[PDB]
Structure formats: C-alpha cells, structure tokens
Structure 1
Amino acid sequence: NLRSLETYEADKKKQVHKKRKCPGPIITYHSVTVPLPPARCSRTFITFSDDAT
C-alpha cells in the first residue's frame, strides 16, 4: 500500500466529471460494426437519456 501511494505521485474520472457537467438530457449517437476479413456490417444506435427528449 505504501508503494502504491508513493507511485501514485484518471482519465475515467475526468470522463465522469464531464458526465457530471452534462445537464442530463443528453442524446448519444452511437454506431458500431456488427457481424451479419470476416463478413460484418454497421449498426446504428441512438440512446436517449430521459423521456423528455
């Protein structure tokens, strides 16, 4: 534990902070490659935070 503390002298925390700053009704455009090089295709998703949007 002492070595860990001395060596600690995170990006995920900054992303969580960015999320905090988000008012809350954030819509995310997300598209990912999915299978049907190997045969595959692209799929699109759109996540809505709250029902208001």
Structure 2
Amino acid sequence: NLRSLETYEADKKKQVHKKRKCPGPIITYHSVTVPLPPARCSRTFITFSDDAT
C-alpha cells in the first residue's frame, strides 16, 4: 500500500466529471460494426437519456 501511494505521485474520472457537467438530457449517437476479413456490417443506435427528449 505504501508503494502504491508513493507511485501514485484518471482519465475515467475526468470522463465522469464531464458526465456530471452534462445537464442530463443528453442524446448519444452511437454506431458500431456488427457481424451479419470476416463478413460484418454497421449498426446504428441512438440512446436517449430521459423521456423528455
């Protein structure tokens, strides 16, 4: 534990902070490659935070 503390002298925390700053009704455009090089295709998703949007 002492070595860990001395060596700690995170990006995920900054992303969580960015999330905090988000008012809350954030819509995310997300598209990922999915299978049907190997045969595959692209799929699109759109996540809505709250029902208001």
Q: Considering the TM-score relative to the shorter chain, is it more than 0.5?
A: yes
Equivalence for 1:14: 14
Q: Percent identity?
A: 100
SS at 1:31's partner residue?
Answer: strand
SS where residue 9 of structure 1 aligns?
coil
**If the length of structure 2 is used for normalisation, what is the TM-score?**
1.00
C-alpha RMSD of matched pairs (Å): 0.0
1:9-41 deviation per Cα after TM superposition (whole angstroms, max 9, x unaligned): 000000000000000000000000000000000
Provide the C-alpha distance between the structure 1 equivalents of 2:40 and 2:51, rounded to a whole number of angstroms.
32
Moved over 2 A (4+): none
- With normalisation by structure 1, the TM-score equals 1.00
Whole-angstrom distance in 2 between the partners of 1:43 and 1:26: 20
Shift of 1:7: 0.0
